[model samples]
Target: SQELLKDYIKRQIEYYFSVDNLERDFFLRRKMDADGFLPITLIASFHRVQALTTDISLIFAALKDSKVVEIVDEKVRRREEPEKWPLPP
Candidate 1:
């Protein structure tokens, strides 16, 4: 069950980015958009991972401090991009 949840989180994140093997990096080293906002879906997926893993603080810390994961501003993102939306409408 734990493995499945982790796998689900991994797949969700992979779909969120063009980059491959996001799980391989302890610290995600990717270029963020100018505003540093991540899609709500990816954020939710990570939250799900935290729930299943039973460790909320570490995951939250990673997201907050990593610079790899950032805020979710649908307004800003919708104005600039196409094809994929951060969170589904």
Candidate 2:
């Protein structure tokens, strides 16, 4: 159970590159920036659940606590609205 996490992360990474592409660093960086956050979020959540029984609740809790979902959603929004990217830093 605990050991499967590595495989899960590996599969996720493979799925990412497979579907996501890695052609240009500029675009890749933008895509993978948000993309990268997801696996780590899951990994972090998995780690949070390791010491408990019937701990599925901890996984989702970790996800929400990490704010990875929010960050990725914002990144997607910025992509959809490049105008937002142009605003002063």
Candidate 3:
């Protein structure tokens, strides 16, 4: 069931966030169920977060060069390493 797949993913996310009532606390609280691509949604959200984090980290790096004569440019490009900062967005 497409709806179940969405709900399951939503529930799993809520569980990760430590929400007691995943069904009630999720984005589809008003709706009885969700019907859509759950995996896609997760990917989208993850991508956005990854992009934003990368951007911020790069900005911070640029701002941190106080004593250095050569101020290096921040690399806002995305990377494949999920363990590192700024994941592949």
Candidate 4:
């Protein structure tokens, strides 16, 4: 059901961050997480969240372009970290 899927995403995002305000903002502001990323390179390797990525992006982009940009920028920032950051996922 749509409701279950929605709830699943909310719960997943909440679990991913595990912070109060972040959890709220993650849903309220509709911000995407590191795992809520796109092209979702790791999708082929892992089997979780990739299915929901499309839905999240649609909702995110519809809410605000600025927020979408912010999320994308956050992705770049994470990618810059020297370790796993060195590679483009």
TM-score of each: 0.29, 0.24, 0.22, 0.31
- Residues 1-89 of candidate 4: C-alpha lDDT, one tens digit per residue: 45555555444433333334333433322333344343223221223454565564433332232211223432411222212212122
What are the C-alpha RMSDs, in order, of all predicted structures? 10.2, 11.2, 18.4, 10.0
Q: What local distance difference test score does each model get?
A: 0.38, 0.34, 0.29, 0.34
Q: Higher TM-score: candidate 1 or 3?
A: 1
Candidate 4, poorest ten consecutive residues by summed lDDT: 76-85
Prediction-by-prediction clash tally? 0, 0, 0, 0
Off by more than 4 A, model 3: 19-89
Q: Give per-residue lDDT, candidate 2, residue 66.
A: 32
Residue lDDT tens for model 3, 1-89: 33433333333333322324332434523221122112322322454334433344332333233221112242111112212221112
Over 4 Å off, model 1: 1-52, 72-84, 87-89
- What clash pairs does model 4 have? none
Worst 10 residues of 2 by lDDT: 80-89
Scored by Cα lDDT, where does model 2 land?
Answer: 0.34
Local accuracy of candidate 2 as per-residue lDDT tens digits, 1-89: 54455444434333333323333324333433332433333333343234332344333433334311333432222123233222211
**Candidate 1 structure, TM-score to reference:** 0.29
In candidate 2, stretches whose alpha carbon ends up further than 4 angstroms from where it belongs are 19-89
Which ranges of candidate 4 are over 4 A from the true structure? 19-47, 57-89
Q: Best candidate per TM-score, number? A: 4
